[PDB]
């Protein structure tokens, strides 16, 4: 037969001889494809342009049919990871002679620091076909150089990744260049290393120790008593970069690589679905060392506790259990599982012996965000125009609550900011020379949102601090409780303390209260959350706490964050004894979640209600509602700024409407009462004349005769007793 | 769409891969489906259509196998655009109890294929949904849907531009010049998300022809114009999409039939009629019309009669709630009706909601009444004036 | 899961005798580790038959399988440590010391601890300032029965099974409960609060059996009940109907633990009415512990605990004066004073470990204290 499935294996001999481009595939496949042992063949990934490799006939008795052997440079050109599938094709065009070939090095070393140019001709003389991107290492060093590497950056094309050419020693023009990157015009890929990943350096070091040793030195653990650990349990919140870490291991480790991502093993036939797992493992054990990569294992390995698990899925997870333990290898094969839900892993998988090594893919903090953002601009330094160690820190610090995925989108949106500006200034301007400045990132900041906030939808009209007048005491506390913990986190560590996470706001009707939260949604520097209570309550039993858990789950990942609880009195259960069925469990869940974020987390709880005395005494325990702030009614000074808040656009300065006269007459006015007077008086002016240019005093006079007081004297008395309630005088 | 599929060199200079993944969310009738057709016909790229459960098969793995082969076609034929109509139908949030093993693999395929490396090349995926919060949060991370665009309800300005094109598409049977009537028709259409705007054009043809054939039923049907009165008759008989769920008799009430109460009638026009006719006045003054009025007095007065005529002679929508009708025995349904009704009110904005006997639903909260009334009122206080301007 | 097996296969005539395997204690830990490391033998040469005792005492609550996982991660700590200094270092000559084993616990999650999702931020007796009288009573009622359980069998004195804490908000309560297990204690387990009701009917009912399925873990397991309001807040004395059956299951599985067994019921609460008229039976809760407000002496030690980093004496602040003036503060209310005072001090001008007496005064005027620390009108005679 002529199977269409093939695998890649490195050449048995690595000596930079005549096998630089000639590769042995199969004695019979070439005959079945009418390919002579030495003719032209096209090899590449499915759906991608192949690489013109030289076909050769090997030993049919020893070489398996499904195995394809390549050279030491073919896999480096297209980043062909070992074990990837291949699509054999043919080339029917005699390649044009290479007029110019470029010689470069990835390590930043000039080619003059390598062997003599006469040796260079001998290095690549029998290759026959040369395409850009050929990387060959382990070359002889004339001097005491640590390591050298030569990459053909460019050379000078139907369904071909790189332009085919025929090299000719003694008649090919050779130019020496210092290029260290693959050509961008050819859109060549780049290998990924450990330093290519920013922020998560600590997890990489643990991973490298637990991967390199079993693959290359399996006898160390065997001579050390216990067998080396088998199975890697890689878990992390979404957006941290779990998928790339498995690729990084594949791109770093030099061994057979097999990837099992998604439900790719599910087959219509009953026996075919379970047979796929056995075939993959048998291939891995046949060419050890090898690595098996599993992504989203929880999607194919149900926890089996719930009743939604199917019979087919239960057999799939059981196959790994019966095969992980039942192998004769000492641990040369390493299995890595990637998932985002620690609790969704199968209980049998979590048992010892299956996932011995558990690695948490941490969310980058402020310090880590500086590291990742700095490295991202390294690969785009040609058109960077970004300050070093100064602009990156400012951008990284302001990216509170980021998980890592939003940073790539933010940088991508930074380019889009220049596109709108670049094309707006000139429709035919050159967009390749555009550079991202500080303002572009700030503009892209509002157009890039955290992933945790995608499930929260609130209008939140833009209300600033200026919308609140005469509340310096309220403004005094907010800056200390929000800015100080993050802007001066080292001071807290110097004192070894954490700022209190509780505040019990209370204000008369018409004051800010909720309006301050709109300013918090405007001037906080971090993510803001609000609850439209009592929507958390649900008809079904047990969903009242689950609704809180789901909303509070985002807070941990997006820590630090601020959650606003409007009208928290309804959240607290009623003690009158009416309808006390499910609200009692709500109180217990809220208290327990407060204590659960004490490990130097940035979770902040903000509450405001009109009935401070109707809440349970548990919320008055320190650590839940620490500060009792009396945001009282606006006074004369406050209403002076309140008038300028909404009547700044009004032309009261020219004639009429004296702010000082209103301030004396508006004693006891809340923030809403002052606004109500403007709405009532303004309607008088509009009816008098459709075109309004100024407002007279008589407009307010008619309004004043029909406005009541929304702050009763008893309302103030309720809060004063609440403010001083622990024995009053005592 | 253009740049990721037509300018491959631009992203080569930068060290960031081209963005991929477009998801559209919003209320129905905004025109999400039409935008998908416009992109497919305009852009010269491969188009893949997934209309609901168009890839779901009775076999265990056929549904997942279909996605892999379809996405491989996009990889093989680039540039390609993939359209998944109602992507939320096949990609639930995976948190509800109804989701089982069937929905687990189908959503997991999207995570695998659209990780940013499985497809690559010049493949872009554009999707739409009606409930953004019902989709899998794992799909909303960057690398699958980087940018999400919300298609909101068109305002007066947006409706006028849309309505102008529909009437001016033919330009032969327009019968109106300088857009004086078109702006007038657009200004009098409130809450017309665009589907009703198309329905307004459809019903405009319905109003005519019958009038033309009424006098004499023998004329050319291709020689009949559309007049201003036809659209006026067409707009009154069309209810807003949010109002299509309301089943009320609504007896006709006229203000001239109400004797006296001049003071009450004086302040009503300043609330609804004035903002509609004096929109430019509020922009100059930077103020907003009051939206809260309490009516009280001895029994036997007009009272409820005032609110009936609001839907008749104001030019905006109107939602009617029978006071304590929102009450329900279950905990999660007592205040749910408060948010559900106002969700339709926001959809049918502008609209007026009238409450009967608000005293029962608004206890004094001083230590009396029942918790259920307290639970409702606390919801009422937040929704009327809370974190939302309304 | 012997309970998950069909009871038909567990009836007499199929398995007359069954053995429940418990968590190995400290005595068994040395024997397990000695034979597990007997394969290592003199290759470590750091054992001396005393190093395991330190490891066994620190490695508490391990089911036993994770002990081998400790060895696997111990090899991870070495080799890489040797290769860190020299690239071509001989890995065979490298040896594992005490530092490598101790550092291994950082990247080790025990299988038993993974199931019992708890935080427990390492609370010791240093943080529990004052309450010297409280500690003595708890030790005589908890420490001695647990440590001298075999002695109590011969003595015949009935153990005071059933411990409940009631007092003003802000006291230790849960703080003292989790601190005892830290200093050579036993396994501590507590509920998360929202566990009585989960979703369907019967899924939470069988979860009660799963909670008590482990029963005695090592010597023995303790199932604390924090926030007892979550179990039975209502539907007992009024509006019972047919929804109080969940409380029945939680009360029928607590009388089968005998008296001198070590399995007791410990709970923390604040409202005596939430105790309900069902735990006052002779054998559920016979002795009552009232954790009242701390006295002046307790606040003196608490103040030093919350002013350890602050210079205090260098700035010229008297600690005795602060403790006397902090009267009426109940537990956590004393601690919160520094945090509010700390924020004011920092905002003045780049405060670096410089707190004066005025900082305490400023925060003293903006913190509320407990109100009515007399509980729900009944705290001594538990009879209504
Ligand atoms: N060094 C890095 N550290 C962190 N994130 C990175 C790094 N380099 C790139 N990224 C970005 O991190 C994101 C990781 O891909 P995602 O699609 O967010 O994975 P994911 O959303 O977590 O999917 P799951 O959780 O595996 S199902 C991408 O947007 C990358 O561009
Ligand atoms: N300085 C100000 N402070 C407060 N409100 C102001 C101020 N200036 C104008 N206002 C207006 O007053 C309104 C008061 O509304 P809210 O603050 O939401 O009421 P509240 O004080 O939160 O009491 P509730 O929510 O009914 S318990 C704001 O929405 C503004 O429109
Ligand atoms: N120029 C236009 N501007 C806006 N809408 C238009 C225009 N021309 C036509 N339409 C209408 O826009 C609508 C587009 O359909 P959609 O509103 O996207 O369907 P839908 O109601 O959203 O259903 P789903 O669930 O989204 S598939 C059609 O009713 C068209 O008649
Ligand atoms: N000048 C008028 N003012 C008010 N109602 C009038 C007048 N002339 C006729 N009516 C009719 O009288 C009816 C009185 O009904 P309502 O005013 O709604 O009852 P009500 O007095 O408000 O008692 P309630 O609101 O149900 S407690 C109106 O619905 C009209 O049909
Ligand atoms: N030695 C101490 N004395 C008093 N309070 C302390 C001490 N050490 C810490 N605290 C504080 O006590 C708080 C815990 O108080 P708790 O009484 O446990 O709260 P609670 O309201 O009783 O809820 P539970 O029962 O613990 S879930 C911690 O957040 C500390 O701020």
Which residues pair with residue A256 across a beta bridge? A290
A538 touches chain C (CB under 8 A): no
Among B258, B356, B348, B260, which residue's Cα sits nearest to residue B311?
B348
Residues of A within 8 A of C339 (CB-CB) are 497-500, 626
Are A579 and B15 a contacting pair at CB < 8 A? Answer: no
Q: Which residues line ligand 5 (CB under 6 A)?
A: A 591, 595, 618, 621-623; C 127-129, 169-175, 226-227, 268, 302, 331-332, 335
Number of Cβ pairs closer than 8 Å across A and C?
Answer: 178
Dist CA A200 CA B360 (whole Å): 58
Cβ atoms of residues A431 and A419 within 8 Å: yes
Closest CA in chain C for residue A479: C347
- Which chain B residue's Cα is nearest to A272? B61
Contact, B234 vs B200, CB < 8 A?
Answer: yes
Spatial contact of A396 and A366, defined as CB atoms under 8 Å apart: yes
Euclidean distance between CA atoms A455 and C9, whole angstroms: 49
Alpha-carbon dihedral angle through residues C71, C75, C77, C83, given to the nearest 10 degrees: 180
Cα–Cα distance list, A676 to A402, A670, A706, B350 (Å): 41, 10, 11, 21
CA atoms within 13 A on the CB side of B158: 12
d(CA C316, ligand 5 centre) in Å:
29
**Does B168 touch chain A if contact means CB atoms closer than 8 Å?**
no
Which chain A residues are Cβ-neighbours of B76 within 8 angstroms?
47
State the resolution, in angstroms: 3.8
**Are B371 and A540 an interchain contact pair (Cβ–Cβ within 8 Å)?**
no
What's the CA-to-centroid distance between B265 and ligand 4, angstroms? 15
Residues 490-529 of chain A with CB under 8 A from chain C are 491-492, 494-500
Q: Name chain C contacts of A584, Cβ cutoff 8 Å.
A: 229-230, 233-234
Q: Among candidates A429, A437, A460, A584, which has minimal Cα distance to A522?
A: A460
How far does the centroid of ligand 3 lie from the alpha carbon of residue B195, in Å?
6
Put simply, the chain A residues between 646 and 685 with a CB less than 8 A from any chain B CB are 646, 648-650, 676, 678-680, 682-683
Q: How far apart are CA C90 and CA B54, in angstroms?
A: 61
Q: B19 and A460: CB-CB below 8 Å?
A: no
Distance (Å, rounded) from C-alpha A627 to C-alpha A501?
A: 9
Instruction: Kindly determine whether residue A581 and residue C235, on different chains, have CB atoms separated by under 8 Å.
Output: yes
DSSP annotation of C298 reads H
Report residues whose beta carbon is within 6 angstroms of any ligand 1 atom. A 197-199, 238-239, 241-244, 340, 372, 404-405, 408; B 111, 115-116, 138, 141-144
What end-to-end distance do the CA atoms of chain A give, in Å?
97
Residue A581 to chain C, least CA–CA distance (Å)? 7
Query: Is A641 within 8 Å of chain B by CB?
Result: no
The residue whose two tokens read 């300032």 is C129
Q: Rounded distance, CA A540 to CA C39, Å?
A: 57
* Partner residue opposite C339 with nearest CB, options A491, A500, A589: A500
**3-state class of A729 per DSSP?**
coil
> CB A230: neighbour CB atoms within 10 A?
22
Was C169 annotated as part of a binding site? yes
Please identify which residue in the block is written with the tokens 């098996």.
A292
- Angle, helices A438-447/A391-398, rounded to nearest 10 degrees: 10
Pairing of strands A527-531, A333-339: unpaired
For residue A643, CA distances in Å to A461, A463, A637, A662, A675 come to 20, 16, 10, 9, 8
Q: Output DSSP code: residue A298.
A: G
Backbone phi and psi for residue A54, each to the nearest 5 degrees, phi listed first: -85, 125
Obtained via which technique? Answer: cryo-EM
Among A543, A617, A725, select the one facing C169 at the smallest CB separation: A617
- Alpha carbons within 13 angstroms on the beta-carbon side of residue B328 total 12
Structure tokens at A296: 């989203």
The contacts of residue B210 (CB under 8 Å, 6+ apart) are none
Q: Which of B87, B82, B88, B8 is nearest to B43 (CA)?
A: B82
> Which ligand 4 atom is the nearest neighbour of the CA of B356?
25
* H or E element that contains A88: strand A87-89
Do the beta carbons of residue A53 and residue A23 sit within 8 Å? yes
d(CA C384, CA C381) in angstroms, rounded, equals 8
Task: For residue B227, report the phi and psi dihedrals to the nearest 5 degrees.
Answer: -100, 170
Regarding the beta carbon of A469 and ligand 2, being less than 6 Å apart is answered yes
Query: Cβ–Cβ contacts within 10 Å for residue A255, how many?
Result: 22
| HSE-up of residue A54 (Cα within 13 Å, Cβ side) | 21
CA distance A259 to A290: 11
Distance CA B155, CA C67 (A): 68
Residues 6+ apart with CB under 8 A from A59: A27
Do you find a cis peptide bond into B249, omega within 30 degrees of 0? no
Q: Which residue in C245, A306, A49, A375 sits closest to B101, CA to CA?
A: A306
**SS in 3 state form for B125-178?**
EEEEECCHHHECHHHHCCCCCCEEEECCCCCHHHHHHHHHHHHHCCCCCCCCCC
Nearest to A494 among C239, C353, C367 (CB): C353
Q: In what order do the strands lie in the sheet with B22-25?
A: B46-51, B80-85, B123-129, B22-25, B147-150
Q: Is B146 on the interface with A (CB under 8 A)?
A: yes
User: Is B92 known to sit in a ligand binding site?
Assistant: no
CB contact under 8 A, A405 and B285: no
User: Considering only CA atoms, which of C181, C37, C38, C186 is closest in space to residue C101?
Assistant: C37
Start-to-end CA span in chain B (Å): 35
Of the candidates A261, A377, A378, which has its C-beta nearest B112's C-beta? Answer: A261
Query: Can you give the three-state secondary structure of A375-397, one letter per residue?
Result: HHHHHHHHHCCCCCCCHHHHHHH
CA nearest to A542, candidates B278, B331, B78 = B331
Alpha-carbon distance of A47 to A26, in angstroms, equals 22
CB A250 within 8 A of CB A282: no
CA count, 13 A, side-chain hemisphere, A240 = 25
Query: What does the alpha-carbon distance between residue B377 and residue A690 come to, in Å, rounded to a whole number?
Result: 39
Tokens of C36: 């597990």
Separation in Å, CA B177 to CA B94, B171, B183, B185:
54, 10, 11, 13
User: DSSP secondary structure string, A240-285?
Assistant: S-HHHHHHHHHHHS-SEEEEEESSTT--SSHHHHHHHHHHHHHHHH
Residues 335-354 on A with a CB inside 8 Å of C are: 350-353
Calpha distance B240→B57 (Å, rounded) = 37
CA-derived radius of gyration, chain B: 26
Contacts 24+ apart (CB under 8 A), C371-380: C371/A617, C371/A620, C371/A725, C371/A726, C371/A727, C373/C167, C373/C168, C373/C292, C373/C293, C373/C330, C375/C166, C375/C167, C375/C270, C375/C271, C375/C272, C376/C271, C376/C272, C376/C273, C378/C272, C379/C166, C379/C272, C379/C290
Residue nearest to atom 9 of ligand 4 (CA): B258
Annotated binding site of A for ATP: 236-243, 507-514
Alpha carbon distance C258, C292 (integer Å): 31
Annotated binding site of A: 236-243, 507-514
Residue of B nearest to A645 (CA): B286
Q: Which residues of A touch B65 (CB under 8 A)?
A: 266
Please tell me the distance in Å from A659's CA to the nearest CA on chain C. Answer: 34
CB distance A292 to A335 below 8 Å: yes
Q: Please, where are the H alpha helices in C168-244?
A: 174-179, 203-213
Residue nearest (by alpha carbon) to ligand 2 atom 1? A468
- Residue A302 C-alpha from the chain's centroid: 26
CB atoms within 10 A of CB A682: 24
């Amino acid at each position: 037969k002529l199977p269409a499935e093939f695998i890649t294996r490195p050449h048995p001999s690595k000596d930079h001889g005549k096998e630089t481009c000639t590769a042995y595939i199969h004695p019979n496949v070439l005959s079945s494809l009418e390919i002579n042992p030495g003719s032209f063949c096209t090899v590449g990934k499915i759906g991608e342009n192949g690489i013109l490799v030289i076909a050769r006939a090997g030993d049919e008795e020893v070489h398996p049919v499904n195995v394809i052997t390549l050279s030491t440079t073919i896999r480096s050109v297209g980043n062909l990871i070992l074990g990837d599938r291949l699509e054999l094709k043919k080339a029917q065009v005699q390649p044009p002679y290479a007029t110019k070939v470029t010689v470069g090095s990835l390590q930043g070393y000039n080619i003059l620091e390598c062997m003599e140019e006469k040796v260079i001709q001998k290095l690549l003389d029998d290759s026959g076909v040369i395409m850009p991107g050929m990387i060959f290492q382990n070359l002889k060093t004339k001097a005491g150089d640590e390591s050298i590497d030569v990459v053909i950056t460019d050379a000078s094309n139907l369904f071909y990744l790189s332009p085919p050419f025929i090299f000719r020693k003694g008649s090919t023009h050779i130019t020496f260049s210092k290029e260290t990157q693959a050509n961008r015009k050819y859109n060549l890929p780049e290998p990924l290393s450990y330093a290519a990943v920013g922020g998560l350096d600590k997890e990489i070091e643990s991973l490298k120790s637990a991967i390199e040793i079993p693959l290359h030195q399996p006898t160390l653990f065997s001579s050390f008593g216990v067998s080396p650990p088998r199975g890697i349990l890689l878990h992390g919140p979404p957006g941290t970069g779990k998928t790339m870490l498995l690729r990084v291991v594949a791109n770093t480790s030099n061994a057979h690589v097999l990837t099992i991502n998604g439900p790719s093993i599910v087959s219509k036939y009953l026996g075919e679905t379970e047979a796929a797992l056995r075939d993959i493992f048998n291939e891995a054990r046949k060419y050890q060392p090898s690595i098996i990569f599993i992504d989203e294992i929880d999607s194919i390995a149900p926890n089996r506790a719930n009743d939604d698990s199917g019979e087919v899925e239960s057999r799939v997870v059981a196959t790994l259990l019966t095969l992980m333990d039942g192998m004769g290898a000492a641990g040369k094969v390493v299995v890595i599982a990637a998932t985002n839900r620690p609790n969704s892993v199968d209980p049998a998988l979590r048992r010892p012996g299956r996932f011995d090594q558990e690695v948490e893919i941490g969310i980058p903090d402020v310090d880590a965000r500086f590291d990742i953002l700095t490295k991202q601009f390294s690969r785009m330094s040609s058109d960077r125009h970004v300050l070093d160690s100064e602009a990156i820190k400012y951008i990284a610090s302001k990216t509170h609550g980021y998980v890592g995925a939003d940073l790539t989108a933010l940088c991508r949106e930074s380019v889009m900011k220049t596109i709108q500006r670049g094309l707006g200034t000139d429709a035919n301007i050159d967009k390749f020379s555009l550079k991202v400045t500080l303002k572009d990132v700030e503009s892209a900041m509002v157009d890039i949102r955290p992933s945790a906030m995608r499930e929260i939808f609130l209008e939140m009209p833009k209300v600033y601090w200026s919308d609140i007048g005469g509340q310096e005491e309220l403004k005094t506390k907010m800056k200390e409780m929000i800015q100080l913990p993050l802007e001066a986190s080292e001071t807290f560590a110097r004192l070894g303390i954490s700022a209190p996470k509780g505040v019990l706001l209370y204000g008369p009707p018409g004051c800010s209260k909720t309006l301050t939260a709109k300013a918090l949604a405007t001037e906080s520097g971090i993510n803001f959350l609000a609850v439209k209570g009592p929507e958390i309550f649900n008809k079904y039993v047990g969903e009242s706490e689950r609704a809180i858990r789901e909303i509070f789950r985002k807070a941990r990942s997006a820590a630090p964050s601020i959650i606003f609880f409007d009208e928290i009195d309804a959240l607290s259960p009623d003690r009158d004894g009416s309808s006390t069925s499910a609200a009692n469990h709500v109180l217990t869940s809220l208290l327990n979640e407060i204590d659960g974020v004490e490990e130097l987390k940035g979770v902040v709880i903000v509450a405001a209600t009109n009935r401070p005395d109707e809440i349970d005494a548990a919320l008055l325990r320190p650590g839940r509602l620490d500060r009792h702030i009396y945001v009282g009614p606006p006074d004369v000074n406050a209403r002076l700024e309140i008038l300028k808040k909404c009547t700044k656009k009004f032309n009261t300065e020219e004639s009429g409407v004296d702010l000082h006269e209103l301030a004396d007459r508006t004693e006891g006015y809340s923030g809403a009462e002052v606004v109500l007077l403007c709405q009532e008086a303004g309607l008088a002016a509009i009816m008098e004349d459709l075109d309004v240019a100024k407002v007279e005093l008589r407009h307010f006079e008619k309004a004043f005769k029909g406005i009541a007081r929304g702050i009763t004297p008893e309302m103030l008395s309720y809060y004063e007793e609440f403010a001083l309630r622990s024995g009053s005088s005592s």
